[PDB]
From a paper:
At first, we tried crystalizing full-length CsTAL3 (aa 1–184), but the crystal structure contained only the DLC-like domain (aa 83–177). Despite low sequence identity, the DLC-like domain of CsTAL3 shows structural similarities with the DLC-like domain of FhCaBP2 and 8-kDa human dynein light chain (LC8) with root mean square (r.m.s.) deviation 0.79 and 2.65 Å when 69 Cα and 49 Cα atoms are aligned in Pymol41, respectively. The dimeric interface information calculated by PISA42 is that the dimeric interface area is on average ~1044 Å2 (17.4%) at the total solvent-accessible area of 6033 Å2, and the solvation free energy gain upon formation of the interaction is on average −15.2 kcal/mol. Side chains of these strands also contribute to the hydrophobic interaction. Nonetheless, despite the conservation of the structural characteristics, the amino acid sequences of the dimeric interface are not conserved relative to the other DLC families. The superimposition of LC8 with the peptide and DLC-like domain shows a similar conformation. This result suggests that CsTAL3 may interact with its binding partner proteins in a similar manner.
Tegumental protein of 20.8 kDa from Clonorchis sinensis elicits IgA immune responses in the host and does not cause an IgG response. For this reason, we named the 20.8-kDa tegumental protein from Clonorchis sinensis as CsTAL3. The interesting thing is that similar results were reported for SmTAL2 and FhCaBP2, 40.
Numbering used by the authors:
A (entry chain C), B (entry chain A): 83 to 177
Write the structure that this text describes.
């Protein structure tokens, strides 16, 4: 057990186990979605996936493009990975 | 007064007054930067601007592209605007 090659990690504060099961849930339903409500309830079923599995309130952000974040202290789990040149940002916002 | 026409507001939890001074500081130095060594430390002198002016720790994310966030309760000031088709996201992470 390791992360699929399809998934390219940008950043993680997280166990591989939790990265992997984010992997498994994401890769099948993610590439189907292309314009805006495709993605709108995609993020939402990803958020709703995390809250069920990992606990707390989660924020899921999807990006088509390139980005730059200041670095600051970020308290909860965060996972950032590219799947087929589309970025996925996960933040647990509560426990 | 009002916001310059260049700035297209995506979301705000903020006074116009505080939105405007983000406009003021951003528009001159933001469009100049294209490289990652530019933008990487652009976000940073934007963050470092907000922390001095508005207080607390801020997270500034710049995007070249299109994006989708889940909707959730977001506690502090947040401003999101497009300037010359490059989006700028501000989050105060503490006060």
């Amino acid at each position: 057990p390791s992360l699929p090659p399809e998934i390219i990690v940008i950043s993680a504060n997280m166990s591989l186990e939790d990265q992997i099961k984010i992997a498994r849930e994401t890769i099948p339903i993610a590439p189907g979605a292309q314009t805006s409500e495709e993605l709108g309830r995609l993020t939402e079923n990803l958020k709703s996936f995390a809250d069920k599995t990992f606990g707390g309130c989660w924020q899921v952000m999807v990006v088509d493009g390139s980005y730059w974040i200041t670095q600051t202290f970020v308290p909860n789990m965060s996972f950032q990975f590219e799947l087929y040149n589309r970025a996925y940002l996960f933040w647990q916002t509560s426990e």
